[PDB]
Amino acid sequence: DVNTLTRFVMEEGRKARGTGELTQLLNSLCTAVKAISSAVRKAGIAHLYGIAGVKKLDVLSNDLVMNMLKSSFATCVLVSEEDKHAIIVEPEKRGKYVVCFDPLDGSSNIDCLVSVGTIFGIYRKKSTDEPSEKDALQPGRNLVAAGYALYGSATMLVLAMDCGVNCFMLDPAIGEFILVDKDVKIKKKGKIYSLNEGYAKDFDPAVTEYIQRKKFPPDNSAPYGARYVGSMVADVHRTLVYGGIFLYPANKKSPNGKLRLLYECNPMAYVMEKAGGMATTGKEAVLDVIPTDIHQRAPVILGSPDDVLEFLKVYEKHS
Amino acid sequence: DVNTLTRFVMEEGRKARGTGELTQLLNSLCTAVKAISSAVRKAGIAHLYGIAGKLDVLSNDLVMNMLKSSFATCVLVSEEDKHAIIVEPEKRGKYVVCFDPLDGSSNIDCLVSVGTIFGIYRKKSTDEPSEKDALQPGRNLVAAGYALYGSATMLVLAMDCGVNCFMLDPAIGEFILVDKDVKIKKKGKIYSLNEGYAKDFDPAVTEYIQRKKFPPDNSAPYGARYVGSMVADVHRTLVYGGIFLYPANKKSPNGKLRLLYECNPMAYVMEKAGGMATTGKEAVLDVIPTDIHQRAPVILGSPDDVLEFLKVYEKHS
Amino acid sequence: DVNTLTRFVMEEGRKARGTGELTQLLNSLCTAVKAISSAVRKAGIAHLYGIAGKLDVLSNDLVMNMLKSSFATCVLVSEEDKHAIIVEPEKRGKYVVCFDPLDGSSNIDCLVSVGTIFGIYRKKSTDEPSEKDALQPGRNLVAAGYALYGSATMLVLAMDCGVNCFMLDPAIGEFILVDKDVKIKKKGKIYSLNEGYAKDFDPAVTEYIQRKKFPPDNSAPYGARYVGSMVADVHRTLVYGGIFLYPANKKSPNGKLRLLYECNPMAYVMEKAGGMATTGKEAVLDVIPTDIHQRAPVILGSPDDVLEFLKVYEKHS
Amino acid sequence: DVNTLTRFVMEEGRKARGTGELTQLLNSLCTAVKAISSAVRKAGIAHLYGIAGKLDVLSNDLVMNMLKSSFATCVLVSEEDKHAIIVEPEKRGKYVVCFDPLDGSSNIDCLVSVGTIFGIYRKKSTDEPSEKDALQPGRNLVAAGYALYGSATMLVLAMDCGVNCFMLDPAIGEFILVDKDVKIKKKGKIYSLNEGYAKDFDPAVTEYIQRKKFPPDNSAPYGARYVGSMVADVHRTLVYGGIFLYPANKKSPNGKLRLLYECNPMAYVMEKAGGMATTGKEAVLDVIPTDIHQRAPVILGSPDDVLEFLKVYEKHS
């Protein structure tokens, strides 16, 4: 039987006997992701080049997600990669959920048309205070729903909740997300590692050894493959689909990494664990880091459990 | 003034006072490219999953059929066909088309960027057309380029007049000229290759890569990017500069990429854009193939990076 | 502030504190409407014509399957099926849906406007579900409306809260709310009927039209419009005011339009928008059907025009 | 074998051994028509309604700009511009184009079918271009046609080789040839005119319509259809046979439709399809215009129907 994103979210909400506020959130996000897809694919670009003859793509992305979330009446605190301060929804539009999002990750390399994506995480608000930036300061464990949209060769929405990870394919002919992978689970061990090897000069001693273990296996088994798209959503999804390990580790120059905990690492960490993988900073789980700043960074290693554990074995070996 | 792929080709063909045969060939390719793009973005996938109750095979069918019915071709070589296809006599034209209808599709399970690559030759002589008409060196190319089905769909066309970049506007199904007479940066800051095969690397490749991470002159290291889909990596090299490598080693002494419909069109585009493309031993466009599916090693990109690689390669005798 | 069909339906459903079954019906229907629109605008027609070497049946299959799978329905009535369709036990919900999946499809050869018509009833009896559950008068409708595949694709939804119009944005595949709480003009300037049956017109119909061409008060004559596709004509009536007529004639002594899945939904839209809809003897919404494909005469449109027709009808005893 | 509008036109142009100027003009119109199709179907309307917190003017601008930039024209006459547009010398080509960029757009609020009508003349003298280059009779037309934005989007192209109909596949932004060399029925069963203005009908028009509703013989009355959008009624007339009338009366001694860009392009399609088109006094294509916006009466459609009309017309003369 066919299933859509909207109908699927409605069914799950009906099972749990919820109020519909989260479903109205998820549907609003779905509308915003489709408008980003249409724009990322350059619909109407002929008008920019004068077939008769405006905002830039990350500005438009932020406006779409922001405006769809406010007008969902389901949110109260919004954190975006693009805004210094969390946005507190006006009282007339306030709901109970805190959404942290990256409206367009990978945007640095969109001029070469490589894959980009939207990342989001949803927390129920826990305090009884007036809403503030503080409500966004929850660990990833607290996530109610998380996921990402990947605008690749086709457009897919990957949704993670307690019931598992599900993947939805965008059908541009009808503007519908079609359920194509139910309850996905990552391989126990993979054949690909993903990290920017151009910066090997700054690699932590552990990272140097583990990557050395993948290219020059001690037993002389076959080497792993290397892939690095450079757009976080693309690398993590390939890791989910094919297994393997993705690394953005900390080094001496960047003791807490470069990727952002609230709207890059946590949503991705939440997807990985619900699909049976791991996600660590090296010292602890990403979902266990408690942030003190909504834009603070975290190092992240994620993927198949057997690969992330071998990294931890090597990492431990260097203290 | 606004310009499209279709009008652009007509204007050039009218300039050169040609017969219109290549303009039709290109028009058919472009039509095939919009259909591949439509299917790759999974339009109608809702019917596959029962809303009312293969992709490299389809791409091939689209390109084969649009070229056959263009009446401009006589020999077609595809990654997907073991043997060349000879156009029916009543439909024969004067051109040979080599193509990979959808490269990267083996990893389309992760929605990686994929693309269509093509190169066009004039056939060899008024005899019966044959596979030998496709055994020309890349120097002979009349036109080459690629379609990239990435975050957006772009068609890159290289001819004697240079390299031009056309963006597909899906709202109207038209290719819009957005980059006129493209030229690659003289030097870039990114290198692209699967470092997982380091165990098999040639000394020249090992040394050259060591130079990218650990610069002798103290300058900043290059960044690494490797999508694993040749159209996606090569296009990034064109737009951003840098170097792309799939070199020869001892286990694959002639490489992995295919000479006719992967390497030659991309070297042709590169040279036309001011870049270089080498086998290590010689220019890609100078290899004379003896098999339509033969492979070649390829290093292509910004001239100073390809020249810097060649110095190391020369240095290893 | 922006609003979509889905968000509008959910907000209304949450206001009334319902279970979500009707909302799930509406979402499934909306999905089928977008697939029907895609097919009516001929997406993919190139593959029908061999680029790689019936419409009303698909419309019915899309709706049947999207409604079955909503778990919200138990009896389905389609213009395309002789007998009512009983949903299988594991998929049963409490709603009865009568619909024309593609009305006007007979003249789709000329690219005339076509449309989808639907009415939604809560099942009223506690018996095993059967064809009998669809024989309710239009007064009982919970929701009704239509999709017009015209110059653009618009969905018109009528409920207790009134009539709302949603324009399909094909760039993103979402229905956008563009007209809130729509209400028809009190009196209009256009009449709509197939004047080819004039030889068979009842005297009341002939006279009322004579008043439109030759106004007794010297005012301007009404304009005539008759497209021949009921969704197109009624929507023009809704948007511009005026009157639409499909009266009884000799080949159609009980009228021609179907009461269940054409007249009732349109009557419901009209009344909820402040218009009228009559058979001549009584309101369309008060007719009690005895057969799922039975016909009825219908005069509908602006309230002053329908009342002007009714006075003329009364005068003829 | 599949065929597109672009490939078909190139084939016809290569056959005739023309310069390619008309092919560029025709190819520019096609791109303009698809952009009009995108806007009429309301792509991007969600941005207009604030998702991120003109139509006949845009239609005119798309055609004007695409034709100017085609380098194929020198004089442009539009329903939307008081004076002919003279192309700057560096963009001048040999053709004069007359057009209604969006006919029927007055009633587009109701999502009625709308359309684009065009006629193409070779300029006849070597003088500096002026309005006088557009005052040629329709006999002189080199190509004419219309785009219908109906349930789907179709392009109807008429030339000396005949009339051909192309369906836009929106999935790929391509016009697919679906009806080659179409010819109208010798006689039809539909008449089309605004009968609401019967008070103003010429006595001849009154009688002929009376014969259609009340056939003097045994046959069945004709059916009536009137969309009120000229492109839709004429196209239905072409596809189904019959007659379309916007005739002259005493309040409008020269009719209402404009000769250069409404009546002539439609007369040309009709004659090329084997139909007729008359003002009552003479063939539409024979009128010598003296003003670029002058009006003409027009009766067109199936030949036996127009001849029967002319017999009645002669009777009152």
Ligand SMILES: Cn1cc(S(=O)(=O)NC(=O)Nc2ncc(Br)s2)c2cccc(OCC(N)=O)c21
């Ligand atoms: C997807 N989803 C949504 C909600 S809810 O609270 O908004 N309730 C609703 O929407 N009810 C509805 N009523 C009518 C309609 Br029609 S939908 C919800 C609650 C718990 C868990 C969920 O997902 C399962 C998971 N794996 O976590 C939920």
Ligand SMILES: Cn1cc(S(=O)(=O)NC(=O)Nc2ncc(Br)s2)c2cccc(OCC(N)=O)c21
């Ligand atoms: C794009 N292009 C196509 C052809 S051709 O031989 O097919 N002739 C035509 O198309 N004639 C035509 N006549 C009317 C129309 Br309307 S098209 C051609 C020849 C030389 C150089 C070209 O491009 C410049 C370059 N290669 O740098 C050419």
Ligand SMILES: Cn1cc(S(=O)(=O)NC(=O)Nc2ncc(Br)s2)c2cccc(OCC(N)=O)c21
């Ligand atoms: C639009 N609508 C829908 C329903 S319902 O029963 O399906 N309930 C729901 O959907 N609940 C939901 N819970 C969470 C979500 Br999220 S939706 C409904 C019932 C009565 C009247 C309606 O319309 C009001 C009107 N405008 O007349 C209704």
Ligand SMILES: Cn1cc(S(=O)(=O)NC(=O)Nc2ncc(Br)s2)c2cccc(OCC(N)=O)c21
């Ligand atoms: C469709 N068409 C177009 C032209 S033309 O002058 O522009 N010539 C060309 O385009 N040549 C070309 N050369 C290369 C390419 Br590739 S096209 C033309 C002339 C006469 C008759 C036509 O149609 C048949 C009919 N009238 O019935 C014509």
